């Protein structure tokens, strides 16, 4: 979430990111319930106040809200104890932010995201863009390994595909920012634009990428002015599920049919409907590709036709249980690197060695009944030395 | 005794050649210049080297050597010629080796050259590792040959490995550049079924295999079990292997060395092992007398963990006191000669118990004083002087 993204930041980047135009307001809206009230209170105070007052300024009931809000805003570093006055820069910017100093667009965003997903899946016809392809490849959801051949889809790719559009886009933009820092694009400048949307060379490239994603559209041969789409700020279902593992989806866009075929066997395709079967073969194929039953169940539930909304639960218990059992049927091997010792002599002496590999992060599996500790070869030169020291101590 | 003396000061040189031994402060050319401790260790090393010659050339051939010497002497002892033949009553080293070579056809000149003419004992440091993939046991035996009393051994070396399929002997060739010796290991199909594990002798016993490793079949290893060299072994087993070697071995020197090596592992499984040794008649009595002192040392080391009464007290009241009165000792009947020795050695080890304050507990001192007060010896056919003297000790 955006709260996680902002919490994972340093004070030096935080105060700079608190730009005058929008950031002080976008981060304010994040404040879930009560911290808004305290920010408004001590927006006009130039004198810090004791912490005991803030502690006792919430009744005994519902105090956990007080502690959680205080911790969240301490992490955000909106104020400092100074002994709880707010940061002067944030106070000034917030005062400046508080009395101081379309139908075609949504369709465009939908179509652009749909073609992006078409390219993501193995669609022969899709929009071509080398920058988009390499960005998706380095986002961790795609791997090519051969420039001549079109890139394939990794295991995480299917999971990302089956996610809903809001979370899908949000995670995609999170990965975009994380890779922006890697490629060298300043994070603060690009981040501030997202906040400003909900109200330079790097800016131009970032806006180009956003337009490729379909969140914005200049509409004037790439002019300075832009008109953000609905997705920039941040529908009825069509699938009918039977009790015999049969799906009737009122789908005209090929994207939905492809998504359904990812985990179902298609039987018929009518102009305004398509018939598929959820069989062991298709479900286990999806599970092997990497999906888990939770994504499939959530996808079918969110794309649930209004006819089946009346029944509770919306998705039949037999279908849900069958999908879950099919996914459980498979349990899979793992991969790690390690080295094992033996002849550990005294018992109380083996317990002290277990804490050496656990603190360094090179321990995989321990055994106090046989004395059997696995150590990765990456930290083999540090565990052996410790063992030698212990032997010397005797 | 001899490895302690030879590592302490130089070494004992049987058969010197005329100084041959300059590492020690007296001359070994005459018996009246020898130190008395050197004379005692000389006789001790001489009879151990004769046991080694019996190990190479069997005991019946050895008794035939001695009978040939005695028979030459007794044919010599009846002549009247003034020493034409009376010098057959005098033995030498060359005559003894020649009589050995006459009766057996083997000469012992490497063994004589190593253990007589050379004046040193050997030190063995062993450690093992079990290779689960190739099912082998990789021993690692290194010698300390740079100490002042030591020498380098290059002969063969017997090792006895007790695995789940039984006890197997292996001969290792320990040349100068040798360090790793790979010996093969057998199955672990006596852990699949509960079957009895066969021992060094022909018998077999039920073992509790819960402490054993799941991947290794081997229960214990003994480097040079028959004491066929003049050696000091320092083997690094795991503590459960020492406990299995204390419980189920049919060799008293291995039970003694496992008692000696269990003092470094104060775990409660070792306390259970020594307590099961102490309760066990049909164990040799000098092993139980050592297990008393080992149990006292282990009990001193695991204070602030010890649960019930002090060590060996409940065991003393179970073995040697009345059933109706626990604190009154039974009247003295010393006719068993093994529970007499164990009874007179158990409070002596029990008095080495110490509390968290480093003072002997007043539960053991009161127990010893009640052993002294309630002592009645008007009924046995044996005297009480050694038992009362051990009570004062």
């Amino acid at each position: 979430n955006l709260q996680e993204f902002l919490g994972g930041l340093s004070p030096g980047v935080l105060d700079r990111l608190y730009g005058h135009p929008a950031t002080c307001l976008a981060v304010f809206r994040e404040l879930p319930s009560l911290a808004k009230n305290w920010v408004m209170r001590m927006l006009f105070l130039e004198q810090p106040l004791p912490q005991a007052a803030v502690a006792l300024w919430v009744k005994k009931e519902f105090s956990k809200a007080q502690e959680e809000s205080t911790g969240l805003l301490s992490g955000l570093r909106i104020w400092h104890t100074q002994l709880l006055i707010l940061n002067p820069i944030f106070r000034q910017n917030l005062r400046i932010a508080l009395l101081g100093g379309v139908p075609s667009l949504d369709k465009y965003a939908e179509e652009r995201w749909e073609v992006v997903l078409h390219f993501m899946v193995g669609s022969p016809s899709a929009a071509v863009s080398q920058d988009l392809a390499q960005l998706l490849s380095q986002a961790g959801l795609m791997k090519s390994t051969e420039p001549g051949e079109p890139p394939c889809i990794t295991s995480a790719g299917f999971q990302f595909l089956l996610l809903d559009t809001p979370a899908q886009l949000w995670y995609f933009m999170l990965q975009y920012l994380q890779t922006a820092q890697s490629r060298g694009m300043d994070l603060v400048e690009i981040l501030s634009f997202l906040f400003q949307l909900s109200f330079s060379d790097s800016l131009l490239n970032f806006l180009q990428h956003l337009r490729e994603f379909g969140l914005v559209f200049q509409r004037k041969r790439k002019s300075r002015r832009y008109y953000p789409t609905r997705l920039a700020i941040n529908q009825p279902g069509f699938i009918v599920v039977e009790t015999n593992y049969r799906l009737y989806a009122y789908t005209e866009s090929e994207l939905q049919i492809a998504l359904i075929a990812l985990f179902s066997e298609m039987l018929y395709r009518f102009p305004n409907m398509v018939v598929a079967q959820v069989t062991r073969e298709s479900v286990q194929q999806a599970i092997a590709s990497g999906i888990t039953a939770q994504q499939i169940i959530h996808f079918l539930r969110t794309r649930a036709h209004p006819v089946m909304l009346k029944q509770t639960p919306v998705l039949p218990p037999t279908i849900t249980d069958q999908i879950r059992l099919w996914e459980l049927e498979r349990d899979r091997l793992r991969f790690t690197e390690g080295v094992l010792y033996n002849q550990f002599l005294s018992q109380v002496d083996f317990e002290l060695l277990l804490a050496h590999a656990r603190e360094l992060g090179v321990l995989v599996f321990e055994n106090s009944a046989k004395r059997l500790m696995v150590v990765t070869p990456a930290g083999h030169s540090d565990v052996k030395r410790f063992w030698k020291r212990q032997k010397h101590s005797s | 005794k001899i490895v302690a003396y030879e590592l302490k000061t130089g070494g004992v040189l049987l058969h010197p050649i005329f100084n041959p031994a300059s590492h020690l402060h007296f001359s070994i050319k005459h018996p009246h210049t020898l130190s008395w401790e050197y004379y005692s260790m000389f006789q001790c090393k001489a009879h151990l080297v004769m046991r080694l010659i019996e190990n190479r050339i069997s005991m019946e051939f050895m008794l035939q050597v001695f009978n040939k010497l005695l028979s030459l002497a007794s044919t010599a002892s009846s002549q009247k010629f003034q020493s034409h033949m009376w010098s057959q009553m005098l033995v030498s080293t060359s005559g003894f080796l020649k009589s050995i070579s006459n009766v057996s056809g083997k000469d012992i000149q490497p063994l004589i050259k190593q253990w007589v003419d050379q004046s040193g004992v050997v030190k063995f440091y062993g450690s093992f590792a079990f290779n689960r993939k190739r099912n082998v046991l990789e021993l690692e035996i290194k010698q300390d040959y740079t100490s002042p009393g030591t020498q380098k051994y290059v002969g063969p070396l017997k090792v006895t490995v007790q695995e789940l399929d039984g006890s197997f002997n292996h001969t290792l060739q320990i040349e100068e550049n040798s360090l790793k010796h790979d010996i093969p290991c057998h199955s672990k199909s006596r852990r699949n079924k509960k079957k009895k594990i066969p021992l060094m002798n022909g018998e077999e016993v039920d073992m509790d295999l819960s402490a054993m490793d799941a991947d290794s079949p081997l229960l214990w290893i003994r480097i040079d079990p028959d004491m066929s060299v003049l050696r000091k072994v320092e083997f690094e087993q795991a503590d459960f292997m020492w406990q299995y070697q204390l419980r189920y071995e049919r060799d008293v020197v291995a039970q003694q060395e496992s008692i000696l090596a269990l003092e470094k592992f104060p775990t409660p499984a070792s306390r259970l092992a020594l307590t099961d040794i102490l309760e066990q008649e049909q164990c040799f009595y000098r092993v139980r007398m050592s297990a008393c002192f080992c149990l006292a040392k282990i009990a001193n080391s695991m204070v602030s963990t010890w649960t019930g009464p002090p060590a060996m007290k409940s065991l003393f009241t179970r073995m040697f006191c009345c059933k109706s009165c626990p604190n009154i000792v039974k009247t003295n009947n010393f006719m068993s000669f093994q529970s007499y020795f164990l009874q007179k050695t158990m409070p002596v080890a029990m008095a080495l118990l110490r509390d968290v304050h480093n003072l002997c507990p007043k539960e053991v001192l009161t127990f010893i004083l009640d052993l002294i007060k309630y002592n009645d010896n008007r009924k046995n056919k044996f005297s009480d002087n050694y038992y009362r003297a051990e009570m004062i000790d």
Side-chain angles (χ1 to χ4, degrees):
Chain A
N1 198 321
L2 178 61
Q3 57 172 49
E4 188 201 351
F5 186 65
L6 291 190
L9 291 176
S10 72
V13 69
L14 273 165
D15 55 15
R16 270 98 55 90
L17 172 57
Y18 291 175
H20 56 288
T23 300
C24 61
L25 173 62
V27 182
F28 176 80
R29 299 280 180 69
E30 172 182 349
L31 307 175
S33 284
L34 298 173
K36 296 188 289 297
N37 292 102
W38 291 273
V39 164
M40 271 82 78
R41 299 174 64 190
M42 65 192 66
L43 183 55
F44 289 77
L45 277 286
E46 294 291 340
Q47 199 271 329
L49 57 85
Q51 291 71 246
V54 167
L56 62 85
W57 272 342
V58 165
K59 285 195 184 297
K60 65 210 85 165
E61 198 69 29
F62 315 115
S63 296
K64 314 313 302 194
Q66 173 64 282
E67 292 83 4
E68 56 86 17
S69 71
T70 315
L72 174 59
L73 278 79
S74 83
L76 298 170
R77 297 168 146 287
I78 292 163
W79 62 77
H80 317 306
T81 182
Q82 203 181 8
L83 195 75
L84 295 160
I85 200 171
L86 313 187
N87 301 14
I89 184 61
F90 183 78
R91 166 183 275 90
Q92 193 197 355
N93 281 12
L94 176 51
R95 201 191 312 284
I96 296 303
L98 193 151
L99 179 39
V102 170
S104 170
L105 282 71
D106 55 65
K107 299 306 307 312
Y108 154 84
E110 200 177 9
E111 208 288 328
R112 185 64 60 84
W113 202 231
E114 273 197 52
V115 295
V116 166
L117 295 163
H118 287 117
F119 157 75
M120 178 60 203
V121 301
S123 187
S125 181
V128 301
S129 184
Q130 65 93 29
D131 56 358
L132 185 66
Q134 59 86 34
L135 175 62
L136 288 158
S137 175
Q138 74 193 345
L141 54 78
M142 267 176 81
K143 81 189 183 296
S144 86
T145 71
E146 40 182 359
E149 199 72 28
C152 57
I153 296 90
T154 67
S155 296
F158 294 106
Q159 305 191 17
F160 161 92
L161 275 161
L162 295 192
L163 296 196
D164 302 334
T165 316
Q168 190 176 220
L169 192 83
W170 155 245
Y171 160 82
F172 182 58
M173 290 174 69
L174 182 139
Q175 285 299 101
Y176 178 96
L177 297 169
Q178 267 188 12
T179 48
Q181 187 59 45
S182 296
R183 70 182 93 166
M185 289 291 106
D186 49 354
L187 190 145
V188 179
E189 184 60 28
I190 67 184
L191 181 59
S192 198
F193 187 93
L194 309 174
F195 295 161
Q196 191 269 326
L197 276 182
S198 180
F199 298 114
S200 68
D201 190 299
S202 177
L203 281 165
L204 288 156
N205 200 6
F206 170 83
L207 188 68
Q208 194 265 318
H209 280 177
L210 270 293
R211 181 255 297 166
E212 209 161 9
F213 305 155
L215 312 195
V216 295
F217 182 35
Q218 285 86 343
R219 197 164 267 181
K220 201 158 83 72
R221 301 282 81 74
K222 301 290 94 175
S223 66
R224 196 260 293 165
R225 173 60 185 164
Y226 50 84
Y227 288 107
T229 71
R230 264 291 303 286
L231 279 67
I233 296 90
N234 308 116
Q235 60 90 42
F238 50 83
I239 312 190
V240 172
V241 189
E242 303 299 347
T243 63
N244 56 3
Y245 316 110
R246 198 75 74 79
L247 314 171
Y248 302 79
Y250 305 79
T251 54
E252 295 86 349
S253 63
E254 208 274 333
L255 173 62
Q256 301 298 346
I257 297 89
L259 293 182
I260 285 162
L262 282 170
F263 67 98
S264 79
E265 295 194 350
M266 283 178 56
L267 302 190
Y268 308 90
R269 185 162 174 194
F270 305 127
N272 64 357
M273 199 262 277
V274 67
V275 187
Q277 200 188 4
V278 184
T279 61
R280 288 178 62 262
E281 310 173 7
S282 87
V283 161
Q284 273 208 333
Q285 194 189 7
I287 295 286
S289 78
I291 299 144
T292 174
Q294 177 42 244
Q295 287 106 26
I296 290 161
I297 291 158
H298 187 59
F299 172 89
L300 298 168
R301 174 57 184 82
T302 183
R303 289 157 176 82
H305 202 263
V307 65
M308 61 190 299
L309 291 180
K310 284 83 170 171
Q311 56 178 84
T312 183
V314 175
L315 265 290
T318 304
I319 310 307
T320 59
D321 301 7
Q322 194 64 69
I323 296 162
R324 293 211 179 77
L325 211 59
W326 285 348
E327 78 157 1
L328 288 164
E329 186 62 37
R330 302 288 71 124
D331 296 320
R332 274 352 291 166
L333 283 225
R334 240 193 59 185
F335 261 123
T336 225
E337 58 164 20
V339 88
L340 179 95
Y341 315 117
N342 198 0
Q343 188 214 109
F344 285 105
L345 56 131
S346 178
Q347 185 176 357
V348 297
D349 187 74
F350 184 74
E351 294 293 327
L352 184 62
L353 188 63
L354 294 173
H356 182 74
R358 186 179 296 113
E359 184 178 1
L360 270 299
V362 298
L363 193 144
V364 176
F365 181 75
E366 65 183 1
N367 192 0
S368 296
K370 294 181 176 66
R371 305 179 195 94
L372 276 184
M373 180 178 70
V374 176
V375 176
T376 61
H380 181 73
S381 65
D382 188 74
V383 178
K384 44 154 86 177
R385 189 204 176 240
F386 181 76
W387 178 81
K388 263 324 260 205
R389 191 151 92 250
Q390 162 183 276
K391 183 178 179 180
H392 299 291
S393 64
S394 64
Chain B
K1 216 184 287 169
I2 305 163
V3 300
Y5 187 75
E6 290 215 34
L7 297 183
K8 166 198 158 189
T9 166
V12 175
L13 177 51
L14 319 174
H15 193 239
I17 287 303
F18 325 108
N19 49 2
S22 62
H23 44 86
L24 82 184
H25 59 95
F26 46 89
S27 85
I28 58 163
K29 293 167 58 190
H30 208 267
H32 293 318
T33 61
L34 294 190
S35 173
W36 193 254
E37 201 178 2
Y38 187 85
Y39 192 45
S40 302
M41 292 316 147
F42 190 89
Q43 310 170 216
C44 195
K45 198 181 168 171
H47 88 266
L48 291 193
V49 169
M50 282 282 180
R51 193 191 160 261
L52 263 50
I53 303 177
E54 182 258 355
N55 277 15
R56 189 179 267 217
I57 292 183
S58 54
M59 192 203 284
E60 47 96 19
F61 282 164
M62 185 64 106
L63 297 173
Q64 281 170 18
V65 173
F66 299 159
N67 171 62
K68 282 188 159 213
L69 293 186
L70 281 160
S71 180
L72 277 174
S74 75
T75 61
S77 159
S78 50
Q79 313 311 318
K80 138 194 291 176
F81 331 126
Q82 304 78 343
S83 92
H84 289 45
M85 205 160 305
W86 284 350
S87 77
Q88 290 168 22
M89 272 177 304
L90 300 171
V91 77
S92 64
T93 308
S94 70
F96 180 63
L97 302 189
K98 203 193 308 302
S99 170
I100 281 180
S101 177
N102 283 169
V103 83
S104 69
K106 300 178 283 291
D107 72 328
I108 44 167
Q109 197 44 66
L111 194 140
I112 295 294
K113 195 208 167 212
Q114 184 156 25
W115 297 117
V116 179
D117 277 318
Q118 263 198 34
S119 157
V121 298
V122 305
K123 281 181 104 171
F124 283 128
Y125 296 92
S127 83
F128 74 103
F130 177 73
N131 198 299
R132 191 197 171 272
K133 168 184 172 303
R134 323 199 288 116
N135 207 30
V136 308
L137 171 58
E138 326 181 339
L139 282 151
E140 200 261 3
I141 308 172
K142 40 184 188 310
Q143 310 174 53
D144 167 44
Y145 61 96
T146 72
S147 293
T150 42
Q151 78 178 5
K152 153 171 275 37
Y153 188 64
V154 288
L157 185 88
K158 178 154 163 268
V159 57
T160 290
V161 184
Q162 174 87 32
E163 312 171 23
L164 290 159
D165 278 46
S167 187
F168 313 102
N169 318 108
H170 298 85
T171 286
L172 267 43
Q173 206 79 30
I174 55 199
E175 308 193 306
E176 326 83 23
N177 52 51
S178 76
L179 196 75
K180 278 278 178 192
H181 309 280
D182 295 322
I183 73 178
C185 276
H186 290 258
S187 175
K188 45 174 71 63
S189 67
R190 307 227 182 196
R191 201 191 297 126
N192 286 112
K193 286 105 74 175
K194 235 58 184 171
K195 287 205 141 185
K196 339 247 302 170
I197 294 143
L199 289 177
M200 190 181 74
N201 55 338
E203 314 294 296
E204 49 180 358
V205 286
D206 286 24
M207 302 198 191
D208 192 358
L209 308 176
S210 48
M212 203 172 41
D213 273 29
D215 48 296
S216 69
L218 56 97
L219 283 135
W220 66 84
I221 314 161
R222 304 166 60 203
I223 287 184
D224 196 43
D226 293 326
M227 293 169 290
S228 45
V229 286
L230 262 48
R231 87 290 190 278
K232 178 176 187 307
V233 213
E234 286 106 353
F235 202 55
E236 301 269 320
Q237 268 168 52
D239 46 1
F240 72 92
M241 304 190 171
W242 289 118
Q243 290 144 25
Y244 283 137
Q245 191 179 154
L246 185 43
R247 290 192 220 216
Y248 306 104
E249 184 83 75
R250 302 290 92 201
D251 195 5
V252 285
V253 291
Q255 295 189 322
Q256 266 149 35
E257 78 194 10
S258 56
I259 275 168
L260 201 40
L262 271 191
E263 300 169 357
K264 323 172 291 184
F265 314 106
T267 60
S270 58
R271 167 186 173 190
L272 182 59
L274 298 151
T275 315
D276 290 333
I277 284 297
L278 258 179
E279 250 178 332
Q280 198 195 320
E281 296 92 5
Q282 95 193 17
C283 181
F284 180 50
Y285 75 98
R286 299 186 164 278
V287 178
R288 307 158 78 194
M289 297 201 317
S290 299
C292 291
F293 289 85
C294 184
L295 188 49
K297 289 169 194 164
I298 279 178
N300 292 1
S301 73
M302 55 195 266
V303 291
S304 74
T305 303
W306 198 275
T307 54
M312 303 153 277
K313 176 167 149 49
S314 176
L315 182 52
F316 202 99
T317 57
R318 179 187 320 148
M319 267 202 278
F320 306 110
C321 300
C322 302
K323 279 90 167 181
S324 60
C325 301
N327 53 12
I328 315 294
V329 67
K330 281 195 183 299
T331 75
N332 289 349
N333 191 20
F334 294 152
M335 67 178 289
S336 161
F337 294 163
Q338 322 196 19
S339 32
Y340 158 67
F341 276 126
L342 189 54
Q343 182 189 181
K344 93 190 208 195
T345 196
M346 211 180 295
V348 185
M350 217 188 306
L352 292 151
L353 266 297
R354 297 296 186 255
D355 270 337
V356 198
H357 325 290
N358 293 115
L359 289 138
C360 173
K362 178 76 170 218
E363 233 180 313
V364 220
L365 168 65
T366 306
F367 177 73
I368 287 155
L369 292 172
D370 296 349
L371 270 161
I372 289 177
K373 172 151 60 169
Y374 294 107
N375 180 41
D376 209 57
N377 203 81
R378 303 173 301 161
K379 280 131 84 173
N380 47 358
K381 330 170 301 183
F382 302 111
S383 294
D384 211 1
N385 49 302
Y386 290 106
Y387 176 61
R388 290 199 306 251
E390 293 294 336
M391 286 328 285
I392 304 301
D393 293 348

